[PDB]
Structure formats: C-alpha cells, structure tokens
Amino acid sequence: MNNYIFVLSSLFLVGCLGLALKPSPIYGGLGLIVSGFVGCLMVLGFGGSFLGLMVFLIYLGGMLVVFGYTTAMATEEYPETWGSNWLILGFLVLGVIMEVFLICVLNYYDEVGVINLDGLGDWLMYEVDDVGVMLEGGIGVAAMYSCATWMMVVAGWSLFAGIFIIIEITRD
Amino acid sequence: MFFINILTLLVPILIAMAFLTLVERKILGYMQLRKGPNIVGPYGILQPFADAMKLFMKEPMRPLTTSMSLFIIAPTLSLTLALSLWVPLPMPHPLINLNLGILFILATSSLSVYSILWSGWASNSKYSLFGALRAVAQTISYEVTMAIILLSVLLMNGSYSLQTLITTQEHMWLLLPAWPMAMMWFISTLAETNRAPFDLTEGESELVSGFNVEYAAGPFALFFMAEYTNIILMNALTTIIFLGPLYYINLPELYSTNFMMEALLLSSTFLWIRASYPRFRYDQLMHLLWKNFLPLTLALCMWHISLPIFTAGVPPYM
Amino acid sequence: MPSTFFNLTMAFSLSLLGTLMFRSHLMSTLLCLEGMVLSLFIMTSVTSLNSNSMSSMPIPITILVFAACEAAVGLALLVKVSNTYGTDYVQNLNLLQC
Amino acid sequence: PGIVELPTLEELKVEEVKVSSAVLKAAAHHYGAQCDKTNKEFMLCRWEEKDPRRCLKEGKLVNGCALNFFRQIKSHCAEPFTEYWTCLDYSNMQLFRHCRQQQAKFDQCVLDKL
Amino acid sequence: MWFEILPGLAIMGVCLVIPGVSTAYIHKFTNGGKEKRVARVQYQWYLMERDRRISGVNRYYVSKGLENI
Amino acid sequence: MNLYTVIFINILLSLTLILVAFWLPQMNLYSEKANPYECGFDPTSSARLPFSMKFFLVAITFLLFDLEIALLLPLPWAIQTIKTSTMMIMAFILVTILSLGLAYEWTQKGLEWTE
Amino acid sequence: AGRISAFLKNAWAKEPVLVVSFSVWGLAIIMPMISPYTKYASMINKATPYNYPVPVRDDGNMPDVPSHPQDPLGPSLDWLKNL
Amino acid sequence: MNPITLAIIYFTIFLGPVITMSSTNLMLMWVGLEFSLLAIIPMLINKKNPRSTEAATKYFVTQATASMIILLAIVLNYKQLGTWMFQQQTNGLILNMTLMALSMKLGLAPFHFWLPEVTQGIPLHMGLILLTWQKIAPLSILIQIYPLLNSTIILMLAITSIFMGAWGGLNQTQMRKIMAYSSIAHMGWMLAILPYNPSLTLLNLMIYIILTAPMFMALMLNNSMTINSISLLWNKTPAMLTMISLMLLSLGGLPPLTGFLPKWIIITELMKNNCLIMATLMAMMALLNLFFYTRLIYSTSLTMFPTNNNSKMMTHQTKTKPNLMFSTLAIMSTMTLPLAPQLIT
Numbered sequence A: 001m002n003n004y005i006f007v008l009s010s011l012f013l014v015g016c017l018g019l020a021l022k023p024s025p026i027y028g029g030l031g032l033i034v035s036g037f038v039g040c041l042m043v044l045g046f047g048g049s050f051l052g053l054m055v056f057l058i059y060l061g062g063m064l065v066v067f068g069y070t071t072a073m074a075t076e077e078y079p080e081t082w083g084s085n086w087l088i089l090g091f092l093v094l095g096v097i098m099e100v101f102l103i104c105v106l107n108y109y110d111e112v113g114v115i116n117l118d119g120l121g122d123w124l125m126y127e128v129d130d131v132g133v134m135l136e137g138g139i140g141v142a143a144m145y146s147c148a149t150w151m152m153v154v155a156g157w158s159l160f161a162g163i164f165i166i167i168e169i170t171r172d
Numbered sequence B: 001m002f003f004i005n006i007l008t009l010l011v012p013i014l015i016a017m018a019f020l021t022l023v024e025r026k027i028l029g030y031m032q033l034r035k036g037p038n039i040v041g042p043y044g045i046l047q048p049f050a051d052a053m054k055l056f057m058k059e060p061m062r063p064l065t066t067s068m069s070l071f072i073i074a075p076t077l078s079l080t081l082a083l084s085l086w087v088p089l090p091m092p093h094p095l096i097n098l099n100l101g102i103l104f105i106l107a108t109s110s111l112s113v114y115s116i117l118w119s120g121w122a123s124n125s126k127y128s129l130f131g132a133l134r135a136v137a138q139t140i141s142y143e144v145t146m147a148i149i150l151l152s153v154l155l156m157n158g159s160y161s162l163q164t165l166i167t168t169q170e171h172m173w174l175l176l177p178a179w180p181m182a183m184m185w186f187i188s189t190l191a192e193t194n195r196a197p198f199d200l201t202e203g204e205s206e207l208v209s210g211f212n213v214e215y216a217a218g219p220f221a222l223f224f225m226a227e228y229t230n231i232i233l234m235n236a237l238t239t240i241i242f243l244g245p246l247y248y249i250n251l252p253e254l255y256s257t258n259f260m261m262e263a264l265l266l267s268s269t270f271l272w273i274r275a276s277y278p279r280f281r282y283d284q285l286m287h288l289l290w291k292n293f294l295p296l297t298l299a300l301c302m303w304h305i306s307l308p309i310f311t312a313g314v315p316p317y318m
Numbered sequence C: 001m002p003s004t005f006f007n008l009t010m011a012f013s014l015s016l017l018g019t020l021m022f023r024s025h026l027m028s029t030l031l032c033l034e035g036m037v038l039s040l041f042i043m044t045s046v047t048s049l050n051s052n053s054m055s056s057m058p059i060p061i062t063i064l065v066f067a068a069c070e071a072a073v074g075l076a077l078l079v080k081v082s083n084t085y086g087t088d089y090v091q092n093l094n095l096l097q098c
Numbered sequence D: 001p002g003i004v005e006l007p008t009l010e011e012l013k014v015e016e017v018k019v020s021s022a023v024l025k026a027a028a029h030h031y032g033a034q035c036d037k038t039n040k041e042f043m044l045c046r047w048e049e050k051d052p053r054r055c056l057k058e059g060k061l062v063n064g065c066a067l068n069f070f071r072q073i074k075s076h077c078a079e080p081f082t083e084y085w086t087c088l089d090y091s092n093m094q095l096f097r098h099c100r101q102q103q104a105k106f107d108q109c110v111l112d113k114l
Numbered sequence E: 001m002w003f004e005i006l007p008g009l010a011i012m013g014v015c016l017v018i019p020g021v022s023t024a025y026i027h028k029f030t031n032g033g034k035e036k037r038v039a040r041v042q043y044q045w046y047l048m049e050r051d052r053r054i055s056g057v058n059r060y061y062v063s064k065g066l067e068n069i
Numbered sequence F: 001m002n003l004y005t006v007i008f009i010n011i012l013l014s015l016t017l018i019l020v021a022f023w024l025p026q027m028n029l030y031s032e033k034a035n036p037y038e039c040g041f042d043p044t045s046s047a048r049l050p051f052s053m054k055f056f057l058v059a060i061t062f063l064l065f066d067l068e069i070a071l072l073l074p075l076p077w078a079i080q081t082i083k084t085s086t087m088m089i090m091a092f093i094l095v096t097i098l099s100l101g102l103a104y105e106w107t108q109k110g111l112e113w114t115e
Numbered sequence G: 001a002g003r004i005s006a007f008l009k010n011a012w013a014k015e016p017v018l019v020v021s022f023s024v025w026g027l028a029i030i031m032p033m034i035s036p037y038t039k040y041a042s043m044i045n046k047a048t049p050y051n052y053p054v055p056v057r058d059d060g061n062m063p064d065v066p067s068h069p070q071d072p073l074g075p076s077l078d079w080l081k082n083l
Numbered sequence H: 001m002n003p004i005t006l007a008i009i010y011f012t013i014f015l016g017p018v019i020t021m022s023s024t025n026l027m028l029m030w031v032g033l034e035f036s037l038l039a040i041i042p043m044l045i046n047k048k049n050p051r052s053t054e055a056a057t058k059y060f061v062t063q064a065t066a067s068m069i070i071l072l073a074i075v076l077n078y079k080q081l082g083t084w085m086f087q088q089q090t091n092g093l094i095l096n097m098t099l100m101a102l103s104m105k106l107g108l109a110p111f112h113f114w115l116p117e118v119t120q121g122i123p124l125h126m127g128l129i130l131l132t133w134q135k136i137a138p139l140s141i142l143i144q145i146y147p148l149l150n151s152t153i154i155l156m157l158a159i160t161s162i163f164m165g166a167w168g169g170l171n172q173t174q175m176r177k178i179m180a181y182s183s184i185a186h187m188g189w190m191l192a193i194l195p196y197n198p199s200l201t202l203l204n205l206m207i208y209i210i211l212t213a214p215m216f217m218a219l220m221l222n223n224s225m226t227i228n229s230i231s232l233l234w235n236k237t238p239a240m241l242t243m244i245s246l247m248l249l250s251l252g253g254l255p256p257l258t259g260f261l262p263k264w265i266i267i268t269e270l271m272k273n274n275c276l277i278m279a280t281l282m283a284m285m286a287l288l289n290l291f292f293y294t295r296l297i298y299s300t301s302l303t304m305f306p307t308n309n310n311s312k313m314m315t316h317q318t319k320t321k322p323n324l325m326f327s328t329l330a331i332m333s334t335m336t337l338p339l340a341p342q343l344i345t
Ligand SMILES: CCCCCCCCCCCCO[C@@H]1O[C@H](CO)[C@@H](O[C@H]2O[C@H](CO)[C@@H](O)[C@H](O)[C@H]2O)[C@H](O)[C@H]1O
Pocket: A002, A003, A006, A007, A010, A011, A117, A118, A119, A120, A121, A122
C-alpha cells in the first residue's frame, strides 16, 4: 500500500506513452479512457472525491464522441494498434525501459529528490484536519456559486459562446 | 466475512437475473395468449439453466476480420460493470458505503456503453458497426438529461449518498414531490438499458442482431447476463430514489422485503412495456430527449433550485 | 507527492511530444491535446488537495470546461477537413505553401 | 537550526477519559453545560497561543473536569445513563432521534438528582 | 393461466431479499452486534479510531462505559 | 480495500466464464465459418471504411452540455451557503443561458440530422 | 390582447411541453421574491455550526456576549424551533 | 453570419484580451487567451474554402499547443509557490517555457512558420485582426513579468525574428504574406526591448498597429492581394498613392516618418544597457525591410504598370470607401515624429 500511488502514477505515464505513439484513434480513445480512470484513482488517493469522479465522467462522454467521429472521419482499412508496426512497438518497449532507467538513476543520484523510493508512502498526505466536518472537494468546487462567481461567469460564457462557434464552423 | 457477504450479493443477483429471463418469457407469452416455457422443469423453472448450459457448451466465434483483444474484453467488461453497480446499493445497508454513490453509478453506467461500442467495432462487420453507432447516438440522447434529472431530485436529498435517500423518504415517497422527474427518469432507464421501445443497439428487425451479431456461445451469454442484471439494477435504483421502502431501524429486513416487492413490480413493467409498443427510430429517440425531456428537465432543475430557498427547505448536509 | 508529480510532468511531456510529432491523422493529434489537459487537471487537483487549498478547487473544473470548448472546436474543424479531402490526413493541408 | 523543545513523557501523563464515543455523545449536551468554563479556557489558550505545548496545564484541567462530570453520573444516574448510551450506540451514525425515550429518562434523572 | 408465472417470480423475489437481509446480519455479526459505523466525514473516522484505541482489544465496536472510569 | 476486493472478484468471475466458454466446447475452425456475416452473401467492402455521422453537430453540442452539468453537480453543496441570493442568481443564470443556447441551436436546425 | 390568447391557447394544445417549461422557469424566478420564507433559508445555513465557536477574551467591556452558553445573551434559535 | 452570431463572436473576440489585461490570476489570463482562440476560429473559416479550412486548422493546432505549455507553467508555479502569479522566486525554467509558448502564440521566429500561411489563407479584414488585436493579450502577459524574463532568450528570439522577417518578406509577391513578415520583424523589435523598458514595447506596438491598420484598409479598398494587383492603383484609386507610399516608408523606419521613432528609441535604450552588438545587428538587417517596401513603392506610385481594358468600367463607378478612420491613422502614422517627446514619456 506504500507503493499504491506510485504504481498508479506509473500506470498513468504508460497510458500517455501509448497515446503519444498515436495508433488508430480507436485505441487512442481507449488509452485516454484508461488514463482517465487511473487519473481518477490518483485524485481519490490524495483525498479527492468529486474531482476524480468528474474527470472520469467528462472523459467518458468525451471519448464517446471521439469514437463516433473516428468511425466517420479518421478510419482506414487497416487501423493500427500498438503492435502492428515494429517501429511503434519498439518505442513502446524502449519508452518503458527508459522509464525504469530514468527512475532508477534519479533514485541513485539524489535518493530524496524527485524520486525517493525509500520513502514511498511516507509523503502522500501531509496534514489532515482530524476532527473536521466540511472538508470534501465538492465544497471547494461549490465556491463558484458564492465566493468565486467570476470563475463561473467565464466558464458559463465559454460554453454558451461555444454553441454559436461550432454552429458557425460546421455550416456549409 | 466480507467474502461471504460478496457471495450473498452476487449469487442471489445472478439467480434473480436468470429467472428474470424466465419471467420475461412467460409474461410476454401470456400477454400474447401463449404460455411460455412450461416443460423444462416445473412451470419452466429449469429453462434458464438449460439455456445457460447450452450456450457455454457451444463453439464460441473466432471471426477472421475481428480485432480479438477488444472482442474478448467487451463482454468481460459488460458483466463486470453490471455486477459492480450493485455493491453500493443500500437495501437498507450497502456492501460498499460510498459518499458519492450516485456519481459512482453514473460513471460506472457510462463506462458500460464502451462494451457495446468496442464489441461492435471489434467484430469488424457491417451490422455490428451499425449497432455500435446507434449506441453512440443512444447515449448522446439520454445522458444529456439523466444527470440533471438526478440533480433536481438530490436537492431534496442534500447529498449524493444513496443511504441518505432512505432518510429523505422517511415520511413520504419522493415520487409525490418529484413525479414529473420520476416519469422522465423512468423513460431514461429504459433507454439506458437498451430496452424496448429503445432496443436499438440490438434492434433485430433492422440490424439482425446489431452490436453482438458476430457473437456466439458463452461470450454471447455475458452480454445477455449483463443486460438482465442491469434491468434489475436500474429499477432497484428507481425504487430507492422515488419509492422509498419503509425503513425501521429495528426492522431492517422490512426494508429489504418492501424493496424487493417494488423492484419486482418495476421490472415487470419493463417486460410489460416491451410487449406493448413498437420501436422508436433512433433519430426519434434523440428528438424525444433533446426537444421534450431536456427543456422540461432544465425548467424543473431551476424550479428545484428555487423550491428549497423559498420554502426554507434546504436539506441537511449530513 | 514528490514521485507522483514527477510522473505527472513526464506524462505531460510525452503528450506534448505526441502533439509535436505528427503522424497522419489529425484526430490522433487532437487526442494528444486531451492527454495534456488530463495531466494538467490531475496536477492541479493533487496540488490543491496536498496543500488543503479549497479555494483553488474551482480552477481544475475551469480547466476542463475550456478544454471541452477547445476539443469541440477541434472536432468541428476536423469535420471541415474531412469534407474537403475525404480524410483527416494533415499532408493534404498544404495549399498555403503558395 | 534551533532545537525543538518537547515536553517530557512524564509531563504528558494525565488521567484518561477513556469512554467510547456513544458514551461521550449521550452525555455531550450536559457535559457542555457543566464543564463550559474549564473547556472554554483551554480553547482560548489554544487559539491565542497557537502552540499545544503552551496549553498543557489547561489541557489537564479539561480531563479532570470531564472525570468529575462522569463520576457524578456514575454515583446518581448510572442505570438511566447506561440504558441511553447503549441505545444510542446501536445506530451507525449514533443518532439522537432513535433514543428519545431513553434520553428523556436520563434527562429527568440528572434534573432531579443534580 | 397467469398465476403459473408466479413460481419464477417467487424465486426472483427470494433472490432479491437475500442481499439486503444478509448484509444487515453480517454487519451486526462483524460489528459487535451493532450497525456498522458510517464515517462520512473525518470527525466520524476520528471517533472510530479513538474507540479502537481505548477498546483494549483494537476493535472500535467494543464500547467502554462508566465501568471504565 | 473492500471496494477493491469486490471489483476484483467481479473481474475474476467474468474472466473465468470467458475461459470456460473458450476451452470447454468442441471446436471446428474453417474459413467459411469465420468469415464475416452479411445475410448469406459476401460483404462488398470492409466494415472499416468511413461511416457517415448525420448527428455530428448534436454530438459535439453534447460535449459542451456535458461540461454544463459538471458545473451543476456542485449544487447540493452550494445550497448550504450563507450567500443564498448569490448562489440562486448564479444557478438561475447558468440554467437560463444553457436554455438559450439550446433554443438557438434548435431554431438554427442544429438538432436536425443532416441528409 | 386577444391575438396572444389565441396564440397561447394553440401553444397549449400543440406544444404543451414548451409551455410548461417556460411557465415553470418563470415561476422559479418569481417564487423566491414573493415567498415569506425565503429569508429563513440563509438564516438556517447561518445557524449550522460546522466550526468550533472560539471564545473571546473577556476585557470587561462586553455587555452583549454571554459568559455561559445558557446565559440569556447571544443569538437565540427560537425562530427555527417554531418554524 | 446572422446578427446574433456576429455580436456574440465579436464580443468574445473583444472580451478575451480584456480579461487577460485585467486579470490578477494567471489562470484567468489563460482563460482570456482561450476565449481569443475559440472566438477567432469561426471568423477565420467563415468563407469556407480549402485554403480557409487549412488556415483555421493550422491556427488552431499551433495556438492550442502553445496554450497547453502556458498552462503547464502556471500549474508548475502553483505547485512551487502555492500562488497564481509568477514571482521573483519562480523557477527560471518555468519562466522560459512561458516565454517560449507566448512567443509561439505571437508568431515570433523561430516559432513563426505558421503565421505567413494563416494570414495568406484568410480575408484581409481578418488578417488585420490577427496581426493587431490578437497580439495584445500575449504581450500584456509578458509585460507583467518583464523583470523575470531571460534576456538571452529574448534577444535570440528578437534577432531571429528580425532576420527571418527580413529575408521572409524579400521573396513575397503576395501582400498578405508581406504583412505577415512585417509583423514578425516588428515583433522582434517589441520583444528585444521588453526586458529593459516595457514602455518602449508598447510604443512600438502602438505605432505598428496604426501603420498596419490603414495599410490593410488600403489593400481592402480594391482587394489587392498581390503586387500586380496593387500596381493597378494608379488607375483604380490614384488618390491613395501618396499615403500608401509614406506608410510603407514609415513601416520601414525611414526618417523623418513616425516609424523611425520605435527603431530609434529602442536602439537608444538597448545601448544604455550595453546591448551594442544586438542593436547593431538589428538595425542593419532592418534595412532589408526597406528594400522590399521600396520595390512595392516602385510598383504602385513611382512607376505605372500596364493596366487592362475592363478597368475603364471601374472608373465609371463610384466608391464609398475608405472611411475617415483611414485618413486619421494614415496621417498620424507618418507625420507625428515632431511630437516624439509626447510618445515615449
Ligand atoms: C507499471 C507498474 C510499475 C511498477 C513500479 C515499481 C513498483 C514497486 C516500487 C518499488 C519502489 C521501492 O519500493 C519500496 O519502497 C519502500 C518505501 O515505501 C521501501 O521501504 C522499505 O525498505 C527501505 C530500505 O530498503 C526503507 O525505506 C525501509 O527499510 C522500508 O520502509 C522498500 O524497500 C522498497 O522496496
């Protein structure tokens, strides 16, 4: 359990490596779904709750649209996977090896700097208000309705203007 | 002991699913002036087990054009997610007590569409691709209003915790103050479960079998098991949200018995609806949701923000 | 915290490297932008939680809101590209060299 | 670059109020009325001084006040109080509203006796 | 006749009561005869951890009354 | 730990059924059996060719409307505020502009599928 | 205003969903402004004590602050008890 | 576009930079830059041909990538210092990627390659917005953190922009591409002086804008997209020949025109800081701009290119343009050097 968050952030890194190699967007879309789920777990692991569940829900919706767009406008006869092309496969394996190497070397030079494999799990949660009640992340987000209304004004305007923008872009 | 509790949730739910296949076939039969299964076991009560054993003894398809990883993953993901939706359900005490259990349901249910999308794509056949693209349209149709409908209801609950809904309804069904949202919620759960009149991703009269057309044998059974498990889940959810079963701290089993009765009834209306109506056209489902439900859902969300303020009826945080 | 933030920054760098090193599909690049957004969301969220900065939790949500607008415009543009050429390949988008 | 001064383990010895949360919650309303002066002194020290080492003397008076409060319950109202906190302890949230019958019996006792 | 649908319904009905009932009973068996404690907020978790620490047996649900002081 | 435990069991059960389904039955693989289905005749092309999306504009509108509900889901916490009038105005304005956006797209025929 | 009445009547028969949506939207705005209970919603949120009420040091010039929680000074909650 | 769309989109184009210039929080500054990108795309692609689609797409992917790098810097600084503004203690690498990403947003060389292509693919009135209004928000951010910026990266970006703006404009026959290279060269001057005197950055921005706006209006009058098209001015609108010639010489920084002032003052300030070598290189290669402007002056007002028979029908028609904003900007962009002390301090 002391390796739990490092494992998750390590899985997240692999997901972005897979996305960066850009196979067919079908598998790119899947890569973001898995990374989104892993990202939700990391937010949860640091004491989050609302933020982790939001980003997964938003990305579940986002990649469903991308799936629909992919089958219409970004498809070929032979969609590529990570294994299809030896060159992409090699850089996937080499990228994972270079991750193990980069973490291994940085552990050696500093030991407590960016990588501190000896102290994993000791520096996740720093302070916690033990007897508190109103502490969950949803309370913080809800300040858009009371104390940070400007944040919600700009967010609302961008979604509203986005409707007019996409209608203009898409008309013939 | 926690492992025993997992068994006493999963196994009864899987038996309930199996016998819903029997109940559906008999209820549909009798509404059609037929009997339905009455030979394989007494009154057909072994028919589900025969169908299960037949399917898992059948050769499973390995089609040549298929992308095999997603082909196998999709039905596996389908049953996993269907079973996972049950763990936070309070009947009246859940196996897993979640602070944001409603948001857990939406996220898990929203990941469930990808089993349809990937199976249809991975099969690499035209009728399966048609079924996958109807799932894309289906989710766009109903997911736009399902969370806002839930939002308005939970402004009387005061939280996303499922167990709090029991206390919210201690003196009254949430149906009474929220029946217009309950109606729209009920139609949404039909679409969410790909049930008639919105059984479009399979729609056998049009796409032969849609997303699962290339699937045989045991892999096919997983999609079927996942669909029938979800029907029970969504109606049990409707029961806890709007039809608050009677709760007494010293008689928990009274809640469970009342919950089952209402959940059984809501599952029966799903089968009753299937026997009664024709199918929507999948563009018409989108217009139903976006041009009828969505305007009213937005107005009612505004009304349910307005209500607790002007009646001083804000529910407690805790 | 130390090792998690290192890995998240590396995840952003890989997504940016994906953005900067085109293959053929424009859509594959649009997915890399969503990867950078996702990395930055987690980094902001984890920082706010680790510092107990509840007044900053609106900010990660605003990151996703504008990313959705950016992604919607990107897809809208991709429809236009596909209509012209019948694919989303970026090698066709070369008329403005002259 | 200075040494952080910590009280000895001997300085931190106190008589513990080692009763469960349902016992504390059942008595919490009368406890707040009966031990207010000592409790408010300690909390003013903590918020003014911002240092738990500067408030150890007042922290020990909080424990002694709580033990004198519970010994008055023990000598006069033990059985009404036990029936109350045991009923309160059944609920997963330890809710007051499930034991109003037993709360009234306890409240009546501490009113007549004390 | 329609009432021949009921054998399947009764089997369904029994199977849908077991999860609720079994979870309630297993909670009481594994929580000292009481409902399993719900820690929605950090304050509730703190009380459970204090209950575990004063229990003498490292179980939050073993309660200590005035006999302990 | 418990949530991890049950979901792993759910994964474990699903994967076991898949393994049984693939290793228990008798097999008989030959080319005509495994060719893609299309009502008894051969397909004339790949299923991997472009499939036109007539509701593409509704689809990308759904992306924006899905971030609008994300802005609405903190409302249960927001109704606890002392600043009730501010919260109420912000929520009312947010819902109204989203309605106006939907109304505009509706009158522009943006919800009509392309032909 | 007989032309609108025919308009509204037709909209009711033919587009009842939209008529209800606009009516509900208008009612939601109007009701907080005319309700006698609107003022209490903020007051109830204000009376919920999520934080410890830190005492104040008594300087001898605080006639209004109670010295004990059962002093008759300070904010009363009788309005909520009888709401 | 119908009026409602125009109002909303133009309002958002205006709003973004106003948010960026007024924001204390770096996240709200980034939000302002996000509004600019989103709102300008539909205007870029409004005419809907393959070239405008190419221009809007290239603009989107560059700008969105730069926006992510800017956001990374903001988030890294929030991690380091628990605040939403760059400080003296902000890590220098964080500041260097901000500079890199903002310079890519501005089209400074060597992040310039997109800008001549996008300008070529869009209508002239959109090129005008792209090269004037859209510069203000990224520059406004840079001006706020001018003491924190690395002089080495700035001067290298600045000299690179002046060099490539010069050589770039030398090969062009397309007017929209000449203006894009003129933009890049002038941005090189704006940036060079920013870490020393940000007021002189603003002086150069203002003079560049009031030179570029009437130059675009002059192109818009007959829709002159090429040298050969603008060379017909003597027959179509000869009254403009005087002001186009002086605006071109002012853009090139020839005294005694107003456009000499920004180059003169920036050199003075660079040499007050011992930046003699860069100032010499900058001033010497800025002469190459005057060469291609002169060749442009040769083909419009100092010689008369061959005309065509259909142009006689144009002489029968009355025009309603330019508006009187052209004359005001044209005069103030050329004849205001006598008022130089009132423009620098
Ligand atoms: C995609 C998956 C990637 C998997 C990545 C690798 C996962 C495994 C992580 C290995 C990193 C170090 O993991 C483990 O860290 C803990 C701190 O929590 C160390 O902790 C332990 O050992 C070290 C000394 O050896 C001391 O801190 C101490 O004695 C003890 O706490 C373990 O010795 C080390 O093995």
